[model samples]
Target chain A: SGFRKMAFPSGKVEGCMVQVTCGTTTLNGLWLDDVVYCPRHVICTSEDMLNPNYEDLLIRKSNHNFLVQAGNVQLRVIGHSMQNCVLKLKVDTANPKTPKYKFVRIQPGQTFSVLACYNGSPSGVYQCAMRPNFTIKGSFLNGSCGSVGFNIDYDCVSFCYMHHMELPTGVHAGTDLEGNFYGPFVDRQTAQAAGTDTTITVNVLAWLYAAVINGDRWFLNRFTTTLNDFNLVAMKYNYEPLTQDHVDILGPLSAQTGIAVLDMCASLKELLQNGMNGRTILGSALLEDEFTPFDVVRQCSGVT
Target chain B: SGFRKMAFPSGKVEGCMVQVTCGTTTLNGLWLDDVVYCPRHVICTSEDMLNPNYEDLLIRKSNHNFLVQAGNVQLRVIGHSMQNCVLKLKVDTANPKTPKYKFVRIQPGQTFSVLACYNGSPSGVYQCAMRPNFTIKGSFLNGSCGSVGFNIDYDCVSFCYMHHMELPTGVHAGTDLEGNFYGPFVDRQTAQAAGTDTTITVNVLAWLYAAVINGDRWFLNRFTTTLNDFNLVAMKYNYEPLTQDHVDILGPLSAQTGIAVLDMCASLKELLQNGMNGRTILGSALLEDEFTPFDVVRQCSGVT
Candidate 1:
């Protein structure tokens, strides 16, 4: 086994048990063996800090929580039941004024240590910071975290890329049958413009999931209304109309294509209805499991 | 005065005041003079029905609602104070079963008629039908509405093209700092893919309007988390790193670009904050009023 408790020279902490990611197993810096299903099982020292690469810093546990301490800062991260819980410990080169330890997010699971952490500078609606000082304890939903000298902390804040970016227009805003102001419905120009950016562009399934989760009455209303418009066009043309230019751009608009559109809309809407009760459907299942979001999106959007 | 109330030999409601669009004034079929402000005025008969045309039937009201009765079915449409309330009487050649009447939509205003209207066949998402027969009455948001005889009704329903079409992926889903399941954040692939389709794509302004109106906490959370990610990248790169490929696809990534991004994000977020008090920022103002939604989107997204 590695060295256990011992005080190092200078004002550094040594022999402190810290957990880090080593291949698939979560290893204790002191006792280099596998510890099964227990919280707080790693041992290491602050003096042993390296370049904060992916290997020696990612924390994981089979059925427990993990801890990391830099000076007076103590971060107790929650472990995952399935995958490794990662919080890569790196230096805040962005904040050159102070020698800060930044915790870069590497996974979608949980992390701990609410102490002395607050969303700090260079951290805004888009991000946050957790600097060192004092001590607090809690958890963040999901985002990066960082700390400095046990006095300042930085936590990631919530921000939307689409909300921030310039989007296309021709999306008409109005109400629905229910008298609810429920739109931002896409028109021809908006439809053409909506497809230009990929950052905010989400697969249909993802959009549905978001709409349901958000209980987006406007989105639902807009969805139905726009479907009605498309249907009207289809009824007039005996199929969704597609000129040669349309075909060159958005694929064919045929009777079969119309059926596919109806089916897809029906299926997705049905799926949304299933989640309507409480929005219990999660991203892990709807987005990642069974079919990739890509497959679903391509099938519906004709976005190759 | 124009032709007053009278019944035609063909059982047509004749000399009945019917309104039609004539230049800027709503003209009465019988009387040619300007009627001050009234709900019902124009008089005409079914025998006098011309090609289901815009000038012949687009109803308008100055101080009250307008009515159009086709045999047993009675359609009473509400009028607008600011502009002409329109309901273009069209023929559903799409449904040659019987001579069906289709009411196409125009403008972002209101329309009316509660009797004998139900979303009928060829009316699912995208669109609906309003045929004649049986007495029912109601109003629809903004979409095409159609009718057939005094027995069947086809009404327009809600639908969103984006919700039905395929979209790009690489937008990761996860929670935010608030513990809300908040994502579908863009990775590089999604950022690129989101720019392809213009239909579902919206400008930044429209998207923000949607988010605020929908109170999309997930969108907000994703926005902030993504911003943090961008910030992290910026911190490491001293700016948003842009390769030659990035420059070719997106624009330049420099200090000024970062400032623009930050300023745009900050200003828009602030604007959102103002609207957050009570999603009161109407599309008339935020979308169409002063700065076109397109200009705002371009200023933020860098989309041409």
Candidate 2:
């Protein structure tokens, strides 16, 4: 995995989109005209306006050819393959067409990094402010981007800030396994359903990363602990028992403190061993104590 | 590739056959009872007795099981694949049944190392001796020996000393690319057909390794240079115009000195550059100079 720092130009930094180039191909050619949220579903949907690039269409077109303000962004790439392979990357800032774009050459095990927050200041005062955000994660296989070569699936994500759709700057956000930020949700249900059910939440800061537990889909999110409001992450799905393979980040995870990590369903041996090493690896093996401050119930409680 | 040292018992050192255990299965059980050379094609053929176990049937069975006196065997494992994989090895001298056996766990790109020379002394005299030898190389896919798991083929070989099939002690031997020793052949034709023709060569000391050239079969053997009788190896086949991909060893080969290597068909750039490094990388770029001192002609001479 790789982490990178990108620079954004001075001016209206909001509504700046991130573009990607895999090998020699451009990945952002789909967000056409900012009206249709996706290039595949072209019929001018209702959720289109909720998308970023809200009002800077004319201004961006006149200045820098309507490109996203993706300068000075932080990125983290992750690998999830059983076998070994190389993830070659070149953050291209030279080409005029896709300046500061990340050009990647990767096989099965690697994915593009996630964006944390678009922190900037006001006109005169230096303040770390959060803009309304949108997240996207996608995987491209053998066609245009070339084959993954090996047998695993991979994806890339973008954490974008829209122009006019600003949220409260004082909001506190939750973090995920890859250290990406999620919404300052009003309740647990809205945060848990942040990605899949976009309508159930009023919060505009969405986290849309996907993880698979054996072939079944699962979404991970963070919630405060009931005892002391401590941050903890969970891997949730509509299943019964969870195996060690079900956890996405398999290697030495408890060694570092990033965002809230996936730690709620660890085994007793893992908990004790990590504890002996003076690391805080929390877990609630029981199905009942797995609950957090809010009643955010999850399926598949057992982790072996 | 890995090179390993194996030890043998003290008393009778002649006719020691090496056994291999690949992941948990014995690879030498096929030479059952010592009469039939191979497990397959068993029918008490005339050529059977010419095999090793030439005279020690009675003594070995009575004492420590009728094994080929494979102790103190020097082995070399080579890899031939495009992708990367691990080759795990454990030299097990335990277990009374398969004592001093080499157990290997390998995937594609890796194979059992080749055996160079079986040097030992006479019953009373201290001398480096060469017994009549036989070499066998075989590739096992997903069946008994377990899967190679990745793409490409693999093989293993042994250099054994036959009981009564002793050769001249003062003979000089030729070496191959992997540094394994070949015959002190009377003529070139006998040495070139050392393995396949088994009938033509009076020299029992054989080198039976395999190399591939663009999906075509090629046998490599060492012979003296026509100019000054210096050692050189050649890839002989029934085709014309060899490519760079045709030569099996593709990496920094002219950098090392071992046995006679495949250097007769190297490019001028390879010869010149390796020369700049104070190395002796000889080449016979012409189709005819590829011939060794004693008429060992090979086909397909181009090295580009």
Candidate 3:
């Protein structure tokens, strides 16, 4: 009988690692041990235990080693700062009892790396996970993390959301501690204002579209005032570039809503002309400023 | 004293017949007739009538007449639409005095035409205002209205925001509208579930940005649960395309929040190895049947 040992080599590296091995010599005069067998090598053998069928034995061995067999594998990481962050790794296999990959610590400043090796088995897929040390002060405290898994040959990329960090509360321009610009992030106020402006434009555009589709100039004169108002707000905010995205979402949305071009135009015209004003008068300060300087106006209105 | 009757025509038709005449010969003073003036006829010349400048008084006997003089000219109209809609017509010359013109109502659908015949006067620029009727009911019965004032040229093209719209009471898409793909624009229950999903995704992205910026795989590893959750929801929704817009927003958000990429990876790995009995959890109820299939394991594992 023989046994094998899987070792995770480290050169003074304080992180996580894993390894696997198999026996080469036969055990109980039926099973092989301490020997790593490739898929081809296993298939070439004729020794069987249960059914004594060479093909069946090879098939059983192949299935048994699927998860343990590894080749070149890639790994990704995404997390927050602080210290002593730990990463976990896992794999899917036929083995009833699988050893887990331990914690890989992320020091204040260090790159995470994963190595690849294989036991006696053919190439296959596997899954892996990583986590930060929650116990460490300020480490991974942002309530965000990352993950990665892949086939033996595939490359990998990871993304993290990082929602709980100390982001600048209000709004400012420029890179923050983690190299992110702040002011442009959409908030409730900005979203609301943007929504208002978009509504007006959509109404006007709806009318224009209706005119084009139905060939009616009468509707044009009816909402001429509404159109003028829409035009004024649009000009002030300089929101022309959103047209493409608007068209993309609106095309599908309109189709789903079953709203005809004329109806949409009329609806939007009525909504904008009456709805917005009523809301504005009823203590809703939708628009912040009547006029903004030309330079300032150019920033938000750039073409997409 | 000339008491010529000037019949100012109202609501002109194509070939309406009307006529006026000048005396056969010029009497000591062309006394009076049923006519306004005759073409190329000079009336009176006053050298020093008021402040003395050579003044020649000539009267044109025609349907339309203009006297060249500089003075205050006021035109007013009384009607619902005429509150702000009025035009002043005047001729400026060397001396100042009140000139004469006639006003008549044009039928609602009739076109108003002006035929000016200038004899001898210095050329100057003339301006007029075409004011349209303003009615609160007319303008905003269904839509919003905005206005631009004097010295403003509104650009019809390249103006308008598409996102601003006023919903009737009790309607709004919270922060996750972009990710929603369901009916009734997300009811409260669905919103809550979707909100959880959004929270997870946002958190994951934030962590990813932080991990990338800080190069901490340990922190990156902590994102495994989030990655699994993202995959579950994404797969359940049929693997929607991961757009760059989402990535851009999420990436910077995480980084700004102080999460490092490597640390995120470490956290993710640890979570995968230990959480949920090592069985990768993937899929959410919101995913449509035809949604795209994303590599959930690969994304979380950072295998690129």
Candidate 4:
């Protein structure tokens, strides 16, 4: 019986059916009946769900949980240590084959949290080692990068969707691999949280072509070393640089499938006013197009 | 011939004949069997064999038919090209300023020797460049590179024989200024054409690094002033991507040899053996172990 406001990330979550399905039993309930990917889902049932008798009803509800809530990815630690390592996540959405995500410095017993997401059966690595004690030309897990990661095919909520709600999309200041500084690679969680599909300059497309599609976690600290060379690609185009409001795509994203279709935008403010919310933008940011920079590259390198 | 395999994408065919002859002083027989490269006692014999009737005898055994294939190579090419820049033979100085016997025309299927190391000459620097019409990127014959390379000359026979030999592991694919889309960056030619290698997990170290090593080719083309908020690096463990495979002290061939190396690979399995080819593989792609993922930018945040 009774709380309101609840929903899952997928459309299959139609509505609350306050009945047990062992033989179709009914229960005291809320005033709602239809399910949608609607985000009003905050019944905060943990305490109410503690009642033993209503347990299976939650199980019955689990049936419609089409959204795979893998919860948060990890930074699970092992036998304690004083050493700190930088961790990252690699996500492959449009193509499960690519990779990316991370940040945390930790010791044993500490579980570093990861806020990553993927819609098409999310998958990727949670890399957890530094070049220290590691070799570039050596086997990764065998001798160097001890088993400290989670090989995942997750179906979950995006970090932007879950975590960036209160963050700010401030002025970006960044550095790339070649030691050049620029903000092309700033966090867009704040933007995505605001229902904005970032409008990107043509410059960043190729740099990302390698990063997102490949999950190359070998970046610079605070992404400094990476800035030098990455900026080279940007300066090549004198790209204006993406801000919180700019939503870039050769093709705009489809509100329904939550996918970035090629050949695509509207600005953030425009997108929000037109019919969008945190869920839409965050979900879109979590997924990627086969060609993340499909549009601009087409302009630079002629499309066939 | 039109009924069978005869396709033409270009034209530079000088000849196609089947003939043979026996000779040393006069027992030699063919409409014309000349020995131009002999010493006086090695006696240059040319007009010495204009025997008219031996044509049929020569046809009896059409054994060795070498040389055809005048293919494309370096282009000292053009704005308003005047006379064809004769690829003047850097012939034996013994015959310096020599003329005529060989002609250079840019077309297809012409075989010239290109290789690594000098045929025993005092070494110095050299270079070669191309400036002509071209098109988009695709499955290239050999992986492209940027280094202090060299090219070698193949005996003309092997050049044409080795020309259309193998289907290098070709990955399907591109999207560019002229963009390309392939692979997770899959090998268009290697790994099963459709056989993608994405069975992954996060427990492994970053040996999964170098496969994603890159970012050198960027340049500003027509894409200008278009930045929006699309930089995702603001998103890796936020990585920037790519580093060195630092090839082992290997063939740092001269420029000439670099070109041939660019033009290399197994001629054909049987062709390499039965043809007893000089083409080799090993020592090159060799030595690139799993740890190309060996680089990192230490965090400025510091240790306890």
- By lDDT, the best candidate is 1
DockQ of each: 0.01, 0.01, 0.01, 0.01
| Alpha-carbon lDDT of model 4 | 0.18
Write the residue-wise lDDT of candidate 3 on B1-304 in tens digits.
0000010111111011111112231101000111111112122122222221112222222212222211122111111110111111111211121112222221111111111111111000011111111000011111111110001011111111000111232121211111121222211222221111111232333333433433333323434334444455444433332334444444434445555333443344444334323121121111111110111221232221
Instruction: Give the alpha carbon lDDT tens digit for every residue of A91-191 in model 4.
Output: 11121211232212221111111101122111111111111111111111101111111111122211111111112321111111111212122212223
Candidate 1 has a DockQ of 0.01
Model 2, range B1-304, lDDT digits (tens) per residue? 0000101111111222234332222322112122212111011123442342322322222211222223344322221111111111222232232213222322111212211111121111011122122221111111111111110111111323211111222122222212123343321112222222111110100111101211111222333232121112111221122223323332222222232233333322132223222221111111111111111101112100
Provide TM-scores for the models: 0.17, 0.17, 0.17, 0.18
Model 1: CA > 4 A from native: A1-304, B1-82, B85-304
- State the displacement of the C-alpha of residue B105, model 3, in Å, after optimal TM-score superposition: 75
Please state the Cα-based DockQ of model 4 relative to the true two-chain complex: 0.01
Summing lDDT over every window of 10 consecutive residues in candidate 3 chain A, give the lowest-scoring window: A1-10
lDDT of each: 0.22, 0.20, 0.21, 0.18
Chain B superposition TM-score per model:
0.18, 0.21, 0.19, 0.15
Tens digits of per-residue lDDT for model 2, A1-304: 0000101111111122233232222222111122101111111123432342323322222211222223344222221111111111222232232212222322111212211111121111011112122221111111111111100011111323211111222122222212123343321212223222111110000011101211111222333122111112111221122223323332222222222223333222132223223121111111111111111101111100
Positional deviation of residue B115's Cα in model 4 after best superposition, in angstroms: 19
Model 2 reaches an interface RMSD of 34.3
RMSD of 4: 30.2
